[PDB]
Amino acid sequence: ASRRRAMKSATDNADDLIKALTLAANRERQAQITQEISEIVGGANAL
Amino acid sequence: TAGRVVRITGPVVDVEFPRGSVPELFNALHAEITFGALAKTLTLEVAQHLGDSLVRCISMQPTDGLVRGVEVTDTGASISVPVGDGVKGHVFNALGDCLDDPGYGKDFEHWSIHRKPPAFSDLEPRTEMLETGLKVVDLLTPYVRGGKIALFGGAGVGKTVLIQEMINRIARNFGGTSVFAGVGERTREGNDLWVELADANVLKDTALVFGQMDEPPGTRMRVALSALTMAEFFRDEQGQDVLLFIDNIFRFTQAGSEVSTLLGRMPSAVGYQPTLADEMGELQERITSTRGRSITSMQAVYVPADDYTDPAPATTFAHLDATTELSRAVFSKGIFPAVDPLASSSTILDPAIVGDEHYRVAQEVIRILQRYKDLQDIIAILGIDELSEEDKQLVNRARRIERFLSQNMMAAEQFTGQPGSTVPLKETIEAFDKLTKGEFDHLPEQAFFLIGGLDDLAKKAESL
Amino acid sequence: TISAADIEGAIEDYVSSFSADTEREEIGTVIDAGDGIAHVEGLPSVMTQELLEFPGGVLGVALNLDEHSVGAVILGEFEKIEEGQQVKRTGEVLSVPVGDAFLGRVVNPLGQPIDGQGDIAAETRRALELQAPSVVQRQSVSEPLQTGIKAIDAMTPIGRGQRQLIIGDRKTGKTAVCVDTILNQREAWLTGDPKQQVRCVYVAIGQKGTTIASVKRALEEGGAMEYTTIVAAPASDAAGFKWLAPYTGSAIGQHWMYNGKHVLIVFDDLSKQADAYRAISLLLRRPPGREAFPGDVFYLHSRLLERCAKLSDELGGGSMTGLPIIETKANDISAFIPTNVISITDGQCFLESDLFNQGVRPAINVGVSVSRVGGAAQIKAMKEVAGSLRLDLSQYRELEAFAAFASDLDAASKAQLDRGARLVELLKQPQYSPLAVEEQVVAIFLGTQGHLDSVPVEDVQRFESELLEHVKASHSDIFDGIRETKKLSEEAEEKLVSVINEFKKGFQASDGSSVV
Numbered sequence A: 001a002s003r004r005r006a007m008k009s010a011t012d013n014a015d016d017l018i019k020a021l022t023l024a025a026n027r028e029r030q031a032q033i034t035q036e037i038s039e040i041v042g043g044a045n046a047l
Numbered sequence B: 001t002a003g004r005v006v007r008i009t010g011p012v013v014d015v016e017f018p019r020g021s022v023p024e025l026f027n028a029l030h031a032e033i034t035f036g037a038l039a040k041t042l043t044l045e046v047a048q049h050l051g052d053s054l055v056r057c058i059s060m061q062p063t064d065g066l067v068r069g070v071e072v073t074d075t076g077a078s079i080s081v082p083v084g085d086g087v088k089g090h091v092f093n094a095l096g097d098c099l100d101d102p103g104y105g106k107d108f109e110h111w112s113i114h115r116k117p118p119a120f121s122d123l124e125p126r127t128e129m130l131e132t133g134l135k136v137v138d139l140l141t142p143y144v145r146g147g148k149i150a151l152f153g154g155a156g157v158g159k160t161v162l163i164q165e166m167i168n169r170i171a172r173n174f175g176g177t178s179v180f181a182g183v184g185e186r187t188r189e190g191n192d193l194w195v196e197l198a199d200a201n202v203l204k205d206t207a208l209v210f211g212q213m214d215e216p217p218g219t220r221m222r223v224a225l226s227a228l229t230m231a232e233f234f235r236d237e238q239g240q241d242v243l244l245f246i247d248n249i250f251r252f253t254q255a256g257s258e259v260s261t262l263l264g265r266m267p268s269a270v271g272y273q274p275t276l277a278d279e280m281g282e283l284q285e286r287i288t289s290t291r292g293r294s295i296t297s298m299q300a301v302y303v304p305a306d307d308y309t310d311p312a313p314a315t316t317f318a319h320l321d322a323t324t325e326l327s328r329a330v331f332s333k334g335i336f337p338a339v340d341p342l343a344s345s346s347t348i349l350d351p352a353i354v355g356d357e358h359y360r361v362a363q364e365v366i367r368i369l370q371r372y373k374d375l376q377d378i379i380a381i382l383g384i385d386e387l388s389e390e391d392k393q394l395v396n397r398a399r400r401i402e403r404f405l406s407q408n409m410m411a412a413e414q415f416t417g418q419p420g421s422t423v424p425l426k427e428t429i430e431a432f433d434k435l436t437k438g439e440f441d442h443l444p445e446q447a448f449f450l451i452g453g454l455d456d457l458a459k460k461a462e463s464l
Numbered sequence C: 001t002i003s004a005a006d007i008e009g010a011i012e013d014y015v016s017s018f019s020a021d022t023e024r025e026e027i028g029t030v031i032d033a034g035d036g037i038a039h040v041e042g043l044p045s046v047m048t049q050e051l052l053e054f055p056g057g058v059l060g061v062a063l064n065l066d067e068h069s070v071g072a073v074i075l076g077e078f079e080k081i082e083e084g085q086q087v088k089r090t091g092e093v094l095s096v097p098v099g100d101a102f103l104g105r106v107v108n109p110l111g112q113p114i115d116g117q118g119d120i121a122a123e124t125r126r127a128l129e130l131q132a133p134s135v136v137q138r139q140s141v142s143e144p145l146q147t148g149i150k151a152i153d154a155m156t157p158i159g160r161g162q163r164q165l166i167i168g169d170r171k172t173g174k175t176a177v178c179v180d181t182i183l184n185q186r187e188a189w190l191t192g193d194p195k196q197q198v199r200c201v202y203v204a205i206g207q208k209g210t211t212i213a214s215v216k217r218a219l220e221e222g223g224a225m226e227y228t229t230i231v232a233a234p235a236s237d238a239a240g241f242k243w244l245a246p247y248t249g250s251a252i253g254q255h256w257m258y259n260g261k262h263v264l265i266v267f268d269d270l271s272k273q274a275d276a277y278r279a280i281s282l283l284l285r286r287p288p289g290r291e292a293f294p295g296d297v298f299y300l301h302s303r304l305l306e307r308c309a310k311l312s313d314e315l316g317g318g319s320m321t322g323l324p325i326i327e328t329k330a331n332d333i334s335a336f337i338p339t340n341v342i343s344i345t346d347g348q349c350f351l352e353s354d355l356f357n358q359g360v361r362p363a364i365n366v367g368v369s370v371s372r373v374g375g376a377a378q379i380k381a382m383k384e385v386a387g388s389l390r391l392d393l394s395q396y397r398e399l400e401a402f403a404a405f406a407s408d409l410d411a412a413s414k415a416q417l418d419r420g421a422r423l424v425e426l427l428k429q430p431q432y433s434p435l436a437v438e439e440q441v442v443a444i445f446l447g448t449q450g451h452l453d454s455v456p457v458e459d460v461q462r463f464e465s466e467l468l469e470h471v472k473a474s475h476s477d478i479f480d481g482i483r484e485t486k487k488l489s490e491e492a493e494e495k496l497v498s499v500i501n502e503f504k505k506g507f508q509a510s511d512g513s514s515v516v
């Protein structure tokens, strides 16, 4: 009976890590693509 | 008739000519540079037409110490390099001048560096089972005679050592002519390779050509074409099997990017020059075996920061048939060959032309390693005590197999005192069948590390 | 000297027929060149996409206009271009000579026989740029276009006039599926009337010549060389050929489709075409956008892949089917071209590499694949036999995720897990082995009813194969019935049950036990 609740709480706590990591990954992807496009347009317009 | 120089910047130089005197594309030009201590003869190759009797080109020598108004002369011909039997046992630079003897080799016939790929009507697939003495290449990805073979991996993984071992093992058992080309590498490696080749009698049978990185980007972009010209001349007329080794391919693409930055073209994604794929495809089409002539080429390709998403490796992968890549995780683990079996593949590995036992063993070992890779994280976090009996048995078998793929080679003599060891194919097949059956599980961990043969395994077992 | 007589007669007939005329035309001059493009000035009036002509014999096309300059692209050889040449405006928008002698040969993207075979005949010239069929000239889709693969036609059906996409990771087996489908139609061709006949075409872009030679050898050995043609644009060619080949292939297929013959276009790769277009656009100094791509790139694909569609009975009821192939890297789908091509077509077949690593050879993902047409393109018999195994497989994988470490389960749960495992192990199949419809239906019926639930999962496939062979040897009525009525009868089911029982009574693999 004591064992069961530990697994329950473990799963409940494990979900939020997935959520936070997903948010961080999306933010990083957006930053990378916008940086790349800014750099390429700046390089192209300079000539 | 002669022109003048109006602008100079970096390596690129533009020149002016009078009416009815502009040369066609890819024509050599000579320029004179004078000084108290810096006297040379600049060699330039035409790049593009700017109109108004102006032509922009690049140079193969440093442009330090040049002054405007100096006349530029034309030869009305393309770059050329002497060829023949006398080329054997000598060292040449990009321009073709003999480095060992300044005056040697200035009387043979000459061929233009620019050529044409062979026509499509004379192509034929080549299928042959070429066997070496190394376990991983013999079992996972067998090499193909007369086909493409290449490596992959980041910096400091051990590709050059593998190339040296491979050439040492093969050139002793070859009746044809081999040619070595060095695009980019430290001078120490070239000097040591020359000394090592001189330590045996094989040097007289091969020809070496290479340029270094300290030279301007013009030279780094032309060595491969000269090497291909020599190899093609040897193949076409003698009708003899040839061996070709290329140290790197990334270097000349880097040089092309550098020069195209200044030439005036717009950049592209990840700051690469446009039309890199076209140039790579045009160059890679030269190495090909016709119906009656066979040539075997081994190349090494570098990747930046272990990223396969980079466009250049992705583009150059499509030109290969048999491939073997290296990983850094296995190198950090400790295994010396550092070959990852999961991602590597071949193009002759099917039971149609190979015995079915090979196919079955390969499939079984691949499945076992894949399952271990899957169970990795659970084993690391929750521990081995949580899994069932089947998972524990597969984990132990995976550990045994992963340790067993290691093997010592002769080229490791300089680094470690262990001598070389070689094993045939059938013994490896039987040993892998025994291991995958699961009748060697009683041995300890260290008994399966750096083992050449089964008898050596037994001897090490009796030593603990 | 009969051949000599014919040669002399041909030479004399040609030489005595020499004639030429003196007509005026506009000629311009080149001002600059290099990097695969050249600038030409002096032409007063030239249509866009005109096929120019150069003194050395090389060709070119006009893309960019200006107040005093005309851009150009050199298709073939490039080193002969130099300042001082004279261009000559000729003809009109370029076209392709299409006919019926193209079968069983390999041609240049421009329409030249690069093969060692002699020259080909010509029937009529068709321009590449033509409007697609309108919205009031199409029917609904209803036809069983077989593919020869159990998983593909069991999960995602394909019908005539339906565009289906295959997106895969490196070294997965897309070309093997394409080749199996392309050669599955030998029996269809062997029939007399063209109602079953299909004329297929292949396009290869940016590939090594040895690979094309191997593919041709495989098709020739398969015996399907008689009713196919190949267009090849190897890597050695300039960007123009790689950009222009698919239009030529589509036009050649469309000419056949327009006269009432079913066809099947296949595009080997589309990323290479996009890369070539990007290179040309960047070299012509046009504004760039995201990922260094021009804005109109999406429009490009919409102009090409939309040609194929089912026709109505008023115009002859032709058809055309396309199978574009896309390559993705690092199991990433959010890239530009993958998203565009996914949103432009319908139906997908994802090819994971983890599945191909171990177990399944076809390695087709099931939980993401979808077909829009669905049951409208199925056969009644196999639709009845299907029994909605999709949900069974889904709950099977969902439960077997749990039951890996679980030994005490519900009996029905264990039965469902065993059924799912048996179906998954059944669904595998080797290469170069197409299957006809009747044996597929028989195997699926064997799988669904639970007849093989007593067979150990380790050696099912071999057993199944043997049964099929035996069924083909001592029995032929069931195949005739399913071929004639396209429906499974109850009496045939009873006979098949008796055959299965009597065969399973006498089969052993390892300590086996025949049971009720």
Ligand SMILES: Nc1ncnc2c1ncn2[C@@H]1O[C@H](COP(=O)(O)OP(=O)(O)OP(=O)(O)O)[C@@H](O)[C@H]1O
Pocket: B154, B155, B156, B157, B158, B159, B160, B161, B336, B337, B409, B411, B412, B415, B416
């Ligand atoms: N099989 C091996 N035996 C002995 N040493 C090895 C082996 N494989 C790798 N090493 C060691 O790993 C390093 C690899 O050296 P090396 O410079 O050849 O690397 P590389 O990744 O091939 O790069 P490069 O092209 O710059 O030479 C060396 O320190 C070498 O001693």
Ligand SMILES: Nc1ncnc2c1ncn2[C@@H]1O[C@H](COP(=O)(O)OP(=O)(O)OP(=O)(O)O)[C@@H](O)[C@H]1O
Pocket: B346, B347, B350, C170, C171, C172, C173, C174, C175, C176, C177, C361, C362, C429, C430, C431, C432
């Ligand atoms: N059903 C199968 N059974 C066994 N082996 C298969 C099967 N299908 C494919 N293979 C093997 O998988 C590999 C796939 O090669 P293929 O020519 O299809 O390339 P691909 O994965 O489509 O990739 P690419 O076009 O990028 O080269 C080959 O080695 C082929 O023999």
Ligand SMILES: [Mg+2]
Pocket: B158, B159, B160, B161
């Ligand atoms: Mg090295």
Ligand SMILES: [Mg+2]
Pocket: C172, C173, C174, C175, C176
């Ligand atoms: Mg393929």
